[PDB]
Design a protein around this ligand. Structure first.
Ligand SMILES: CCCCCCCC/C=C/CCCCCCCC(=O)OC[C@H](COP(=O)(O)OCCN)OC(=O)CCCCCCC/C=C/CCCCCCCC
Ligand SMILES: CCCCCCCC/C=C/CCCCCCCC(=O)OC[C@H](COP(=O)(O)OCCN)OC(=O)CCCCCCC/C=C/CCCCCCCC
Ligand SMILES: CCCCCCCC/C=C/CCCCCCCC(=O)OC[C@H](COP(=O)(O)OCCN)OC(=O)CCCCCCC/C=C/CCCCCCCC
Ligand SMILES: CCCCCCCC/C=C\CCCCCCCC(=O)OC[C@H](COP(=O)(O)OCCN)OC(=O)CCCCCCC/C=C/CCCCCCCC
Ligand SMILES: CCCCCCCC/C=C\CCCCCCCC(=O)OC[C@H](COP(=O)(O)OCCN)OC(=O)CCCCCCC/C=C/CCCCCCCC
Ligand SMILES: CCCCCCCC/C=C\CCCCCCCC(=O)OC[C@H](COP(=O)(O)OCCN)OC(=O)CCCCCCC/C=C/CCCCCCCC
Ligand SMILES: CCCCCCCC/C=C\CCCCCCCC(=O)O[C@H](COC(=O)CCCCCCC/C=C/CCCCCCCC)COP(=O)(O)OCCN
Ligand SMILES: CCCCCCCC/C=C\CCCCCCCC(=O)O[C@H](COC(=O)CCCCCCC/C=C/CCCCCCCC)COP(=O)(O)OCCN
Ligand SMILES: CCCCCCCC/C=C\CCCCCCCC(=O)O[C@H](COC(=O)CCCCCCC/C=C/CCCCCCCC)COP(=O)(O)OCCN
Ligand SMILES: CC(C)CCC[C@@H](C)[C@H]1CC[C@H]2[C@@H]3CC=C4C[C@@H](O)CC[C@]4(C)[C@H]3CC[C@]12C
Ligand SMILES: CC(C)CCC[C@@H](C)[C@H]1CC[C@H]2[C@@H]3CC=C4C[C@@H](O)CC[C@]4(C)[C@H]3CC[C@]12C
Ligand SMILES: CC(C)CCC[C@@H](C)[C@H]1CC[C@H]2[C@@H]3CC=C4C[C@@H](O)CC[C@]4(C)[C@H]3CC[C@]12C
Ligand SMILES: CC(C)CCC[C@@H](C)[C@H]1CC[C@H]2[C@@H]3CC=C4C[C@@H](O)CC[C@]4(C)[C@H]3CC[C@]12C
Ligand SMILES: *C\C=C(C)/C=C/C=C(C)/C=C/C1=C(C)CCCC1(C)C
Ligand SMILES: *C\C=C(C)/C=C/C=C(C)/C=C/C1=C(C)CCCC1(C)C
Ligand SMILES: *C\C=C(C)/C=C/C=C(C)/C=C/C1=C(C)CCCC1(C)C
Lengths: 240, 240, 240
């Protein structure tokens, strides 16, 4: 029912729009001046193309949040909503999150990891738009995709977590908290939302989701950016 | 008219959902233990990223079939149908089929081959949704894309079919049967369906399409997987 | 209001459909016989995959124009329109234009350049479909994406424009005219169209847009093709 407090939801989106986008602008700025903390200039003179994927998602996420605010500030139900169809944008950003994570730590099966998340969210898009007993079938189909994705990722992360120096592991550990602790929270709120159990309020739903993306995009991007700065500093200017 | 036997169509989709997805899980499992039949471990320890594209399409095709079943099992006309708009999913899998085929045999013009199929199907999506005299114009526009695509592919396949050892050529020949014998059957059923001639029944349409994807995705994926196993066995452990 | 002269608009689209597609077929034909004007055969025997991106866009643009004509020739409002939602196709071709430009001149930040244009147009798609005070917010959000994109591109182009020989610079200069002189004309007509100021007539809108794509796709593709022919001729057969 169209009775939730959109001005609030819009404001929330606008506030996190600046934070996520601003973090993206910072990490893009921090990328193109130094390999590490000593600001080592790239010998060729061009930062690796895959490195920028962390900043772009935040700007990609920040650009979407601006849209969401515009949807909320206009009273909802806009022709270009990005909120009526849920996880619709996630389809474009979440598969990119694992792509840079796989690129940052050289995790194998990158195309499998992309299509694991890509197929995971399209079930969530299908689950939302289908009010019926088969909504959870898509959820089950979606969870049939994420569960083998969350697994083997923990195995892959663990196999290389022990290779990094202790300085670099602290940021990776905090990336794993964001990664293996909060990504499983999207399916959990799907069960408890008005779609299933009914705990999460229709309005509340957006606000907690607004406050997780910061952790999943921006803060995850910051931890990835700081982790890469530590990684290159230990390997390039030190040769260790 | 909504009077076809969806439970049947759904069951068909569900049965081939397990077969296509199960074949994809097998070929992904068969990929990451051996270069060839001797199960030669990859020297770096990570199977090539382009190799997995054969398995992923089946899981990508199997995930879609589950959706189609859910559309049929719910009586049709679901908000997330994947059946109301035809060839809509093909847009995501058929361009990937030629991408791995081009990658498997090192065929040139891979981006031209991707956009040949990608533009071929978007005319089929447009042809379906347009009941008018211009449906066949999109079909003609689509066939104006596939016909120069089917050609030059036969020339490209032939130029390298004679380089492979006789053991590897048997699977490639059976890939070509699936490739140059069944892909031209999608346009043929478009003419004869209720859209054009009227031979193929609305219901029958789905069942024959359900039974070709197995050949085009799963069986094609199996033949591609077996062909790659023969190819690497002759080249890696034998050096011939 | 559905009272504009579609037969005209359709004819315009059909005439430029042949010109853009025909130019694409020429530059694809011109690509696969010679590195330069001396028709130097590629030593491996396969033109670089990124080189063909100039031809494909024209065929991608020509295929869309055929569709637009079919939409116009059928009276408008077709189920597969490509005209009802504006810049919707641009989302697929404009990000590819900058991708080959970045590839042709080895410009850095290619993924940033792709997502700059990709996010720029999705605001234009959102701006059109949203009749409200927030249409210009998407326009402002879109211009908040293009303005930092148009800039740094001029800096990047200038940094390498002085390295090319004078023969190659003439085509690049004429690419820059098409690039930095006409791309900023799409936002300008958005302001003055019936959406904003009201200068550009609903009908006129399509005809000037039809006549810019030729410059942005086809003629830009020709200038890119001629520029690459000059570039390789000076570097490959001359070694200068
Ligand atoms: C801005 C940066 C974005 C970057 C990346 C974007 C990629 C993601 C693409 C997002 C797709 C957006 C689709 C959203 C559709 C929303 C439909 C909607 O809101 O419907 C509800 C609403 C009913 O509400 P009210 O009438 O208020 O009811 C109360 C009674 N007074 O219905 C409408 O407003 C009618 C909707 C008009 C048509 C919708 C047009 C959607 C825009 C099309 C462009 C997107 C292209 C998608 C590609 C496929 C082509 C369909
Ligand atoms: C699950 C794994 C999938 C993996 C990859 C997915 C990529 C492919 C994307 C598929 C897009 C799906 C679109 C399907 C739309 C179906 C529309 C439909 O069925 O309409 C008919 C039906 C009429 O039938 P009944 O009312 O039964 O008539 C009988 C009278 N009692 O109409 C409806 O049900 C209304 C439809 C509700 C809105 C449709 C919402 C579609 C879902 C949107 C998510 C997809 C995003 C697409 C991106 C662009 C944004 C539009
Ligand atoms: C051909 C080569 C193309 C290559 C690349 C293609 C990629 C770009 C994808 C383009 C998406 C096309 C969407 C266009 C939707 C147009 C809607 C439209 O015209 O509505 C207006 C019109 C009202 O006009 P009239 O009734 O004449 O009014 C006057 C009163 N007598 O409404 C209709 O006709 C109803 C529309 C029927 C349903 C629309 C179906 C759109 C086709 C779906 C396939 C596209 C898939 C998109 C993916 C997401 C799934 C939605
Ligand atoms: C929540 C709101 C929505 C969120 C996003 C809104 C827009 C965000 C702002 C722009 C995002 C990034 C633009 C992407 C295209 C530009 C490519 C790019 O950034 O390249 C990096 C390039 C630097 O590369 P170096 O390595 O020094 O080059 C030497 C070659 N080795 O970046 C730059 O040039 C700096 C940024 C552009 C310079 C132009 C300065 C003037 C810009 C006008 C401001 C317009 C308002 C936008 C506000 C934020 C802008 C930072
Ligand atoms: C028709 C229904 C829909 C069809 C599809 C439904 C889901 C299909 C099942 C999962 C598909 C693939 C998941 C993609 C993300 C995982 C990435 C992946 O497979 O990586 C391969 C990786 C092996 O790599 P190696 O080379 O040994 O690693 C060492 C590094 N050199 O695979 C694995 O780890 C095996 C699969 C995951 C292990 C976790 C085991 C427990 C999984 C719980 C089962 C959940 C139900 C799903 C059923 C099928 C699962 C196989
Ligand atoms: C405005 C209307 C819509 C616009 C577009 C309509 C369709 C455009 C015509 C086809 C576009 C391109 C097709 C893409 C898939 C083909 C791949 C391709 O072109 O590969 C190049 C390959 C040449 O490669 P080389 O380097 O010689 O190979 C040796 C290996 N080193 O091209 C060819 O083989 C030439 C073109 C195909 C040959 C088949 C000839 C017979 C074709 C029947 C004509 C059908 C009508 C289409 C009209 C235009 C066709 C040119
Ligand atoms: C539970 C409370 C949650 C609060 C939300 C978080 C707010 C943002 C603050 C940062 C969160 C993530 C930080 C991750 C840890 C990195 C911090 C850090 O110390 O980084 C340094 C250096 O790296 C950095 O600079 C990273 C921190 C920079 C973060 C900048 C904040 C994000 C950018 C937003 C600016 C624009 C926002 C617009 C205004 C908001 C309007 C609402 C790494 O080295 P140290 O361990 O200090 O060792 C010292 C010797 N090397
Ligand atoms: C006209 C009847 C069509 C019947 C449909 C086909 C059913 C599937 C059977 C396989 C079809 C394709 C097989 C292609 C040929 C490869 C078979 C083969 O022999 O492979 C071997 C080895 O490779 C293989 O193992 C490939 C065959 C494995 C196929 C496994 C079947 C697909 C996986 C599905 C399992 C899960 C399905 C769920 C249950 C179904 C519920 C409906 C290659 O070497 P050989 O020539 O034997 O030489 C011996 C010395 N090297
Ligand atoms: C303001 C008037 C605008 C008119 C529209 C333009 C019409 C198209 C004409 C070409 C426009 C762009 C040309 C760019 C400059 C390149 C021309 C040129 O000279 O190229 C040569 C060689 O390269 C070429 O051949 C490029 C020109 C080829 C252009 C072919 C025209 C496009 C193909 C369309 C054919 C099919 C169209 C269907 C019919 C139309 C139905 C409506 C480069 O060397 P030169 O400087 O001559 O030095 C000589 C010693 N090397
Ligand atoms: C409470 C919520 C936020 C998080 C719940 C998940 C936490 C408990 C998970 C997320 C990521 C996980 C870490 C991921 C990787 C490793 C490296 C391994 O060699 C030891 C365990 C360790 C350190 C894990 C401990 C458990 C961990 C921290
Ligand atoms: C009857 C249906 C299923 C298939 C119709 C197409 C068949 C006849 C086509 C598909 C692929 C084709 C093969 C593709 C490649 C070659 C290699 C060439 O050096 C000799 C011909 C040969 C061996 C072709 C023979 C004809 C062939 C088998
Ligand atoms: C463009 C070149 C490669 C030819 C490929 C397009 C051919 C195969 C297409 C173009 C126009 C098409 C025809 C257009 C209209 C109809 C009417 C319909 O009720 C039966 C099929 C039929 C008769 C089509 C058959 C296929 C056809 C002839
Ligand atoms: C009048 C319309 C069509 C075009 C307006 C933009 C024109 C004036 C712009 C577009 C591209 C620009 C050129 C781009 C690159 C360079 C190289 C630099 O080292 C000197 C300036 C020069 C040569 C620019 C001059 C101005 C220029 C030609
Ligand atoms: C913003 C970034 C991320 C990674 C968001 C991720 C969301 C998921 C991984 C959600 C998964 C879902 C599943 C498994 C089933 C129901 C639908 C969801 C999309 C919520
Ligand atoms: C599932 C995999 C494949 C390769 C399916 C392929 C389908 C085509 C190549 C279909 C082509 C069509 C044409 C040329 C014209 C009418 C519309 C079709 C999509 C049926
Ligand atoms: C056909 C190729 C090109 C490059 C067309 C490009 C169009 C743009 C770069 C348009 C930009 C817009 C902006 C910045 C804001 C309003 C919406 C537009 C899409 C017109």
């Amino acid at each position: 029912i169209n009775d939730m407090d959109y001005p609030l939801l819009g404001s929330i989106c606008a506030v996190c729009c600046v934070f996520v986008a601003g973090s993206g602008i910072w990490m893009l700025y921090r990328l193109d001046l130094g390999m590490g903390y000593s600001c080592k200039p790239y010998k060729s003179g061009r930062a690796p193309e895959v490195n920028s994927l962390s900043g772009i998602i935040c700007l990609l996420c920040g650009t979407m949040y601006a849209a969401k605010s515009f949807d909320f500030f206009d009273g909802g139900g806009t022709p270009f909503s990005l909120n009526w169809y849920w996880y619709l944008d996630y389809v474009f950003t979440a598969p990119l999150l694992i792509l840079d994570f796989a690129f940052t730590l050289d995790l194998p099966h990158k195309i499998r990891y992309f299509f694991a998340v890509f197929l995971t969210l399209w079930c969530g898009v299908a689950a939302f738009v289908t009010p019926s007993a088969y909504r959870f079938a898509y959820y089950a189909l979606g969870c049939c995709w994420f569960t083998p994705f969350a697994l083997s990722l923990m195995r892959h992360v663990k196999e290389r977590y022990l290779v990094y120096p202790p300085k670099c592991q602290r940021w990776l550990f905090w990336a794993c908290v964001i990664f293996f602790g909060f990504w499983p929270m999207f399916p959990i709120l799907f069960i408890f939302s008005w779609l299933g159990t009914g705990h999460i309020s229709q309005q509340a739903f957006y606000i907690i989701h607004a406050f997780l993306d910061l952790t999943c995009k921006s803060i995850f991007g910051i931890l990835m950016t700081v982790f890469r700065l530590e990684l290159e500093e230990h390997t390039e200017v030190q040769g260790l």
